[PDB]
Design an enzyme around this catalytic site. Structure first.
Site: not given
Ligand code: COD
Ligand code: CL
Length: 163
Positions: A43, A92, A130
């Site tokens: 990633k 959001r 992020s």
């Molecule tokens: C979706 C993945 C990539 C990680 O989520 P993401 O990249 O969005 O990460 P992030 O660091 O932004 O945080 C995650 C969560 O926090 C939330 N979030 C981020 N910033 C904010 C904010 N300012 N306010 C509220 N929520 C927030 C996001 O909407 C999300 O729900 C994760 O599920 C993953 O890596 N999964 C494993 C791979 C996999 O199995 N994929 C296919 C089957 S699931």
């Protein structure tokens, strides 16, 4: 009565005041909250797994019921391993919603016991991604309002090591 364990997966690269808000809020309606950092083995994140968990633990350490683990693999398998009640996601941005509905409906096909719950962050945290935070830091811009002090200094020390 059982005992509830919500998994909160993310790259958390870096953790944001947004993430902190959600984890606090989750910490109140669940027994255990696992902040689950995706290693993102293929990633390419900006902060090391160690850097990320550190900044996480620094910001949410004082919460009795919050744990911090790294994980890679299907989130579904991580879910089963953790005997988790449900997976926590924040909503959001609307494009958020269509993917979250998809990743939720899809994982459920893989493991029927799979559950997403969703929180909304405080309107003051709704604009924070992020990604936007990285790009503002990247250009020597102030992010103190959007991320914990831990992270502010942490950016200042990717800048000291070049960047
Ligand atoms: C979706 C993945 C990539 C990680 O989520 P993401 O990249 O969005 O990460 P992030 O660091 O932004 O945080 C995650 C969560 O926090 C939330 N979030 C981020 N910033 C904010 C904010 N300012 N306010 C509220 N929520 C927030 C996001 O909407 C999300 O729900 C994760 O599920 C993953 O890596 N999964 C494993 C791979 C996999 O199995 N994929 C296919 C089957 S699931
Ligand atoms: Cl702070």
């Amino acid at each position: 009565m059982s005992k509830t364990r919500v998994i909160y997966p993310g790259t958390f690269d870096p953790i944001t005041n947004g993430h902190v808000d959600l984890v606090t809020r989750a910490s109140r309606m669940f027994d255990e909250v696992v902040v689950a950092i995706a290693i993102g083995h293929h990633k390419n994140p900006l902060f090391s797994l160690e850097e990320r968990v550190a900044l996480a633990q620094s910001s949410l350490g004082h919460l009795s019921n919050v744990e911090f683990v790294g994980f890679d693999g299907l989130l579904v398998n991580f879910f089963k391993e953790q005997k988790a009640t449900a997976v926590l996601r924040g909503l959001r941005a609307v494009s958020d919603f269509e993917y979250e509905f998809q990743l939720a409906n899809m994982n459920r096909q893989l493991d029927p016991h799979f559950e997403a719950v969703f929180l909304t962050p405080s309107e003051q945290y709704s604009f924070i991604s992020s990604t936007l935070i990285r790009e503002i830091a990247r250009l020597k811009g102030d992010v103190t309002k959007f991320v914990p002090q831990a992270v502010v200094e942490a950016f200042e020390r990717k800048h000291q090591q070049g960047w």
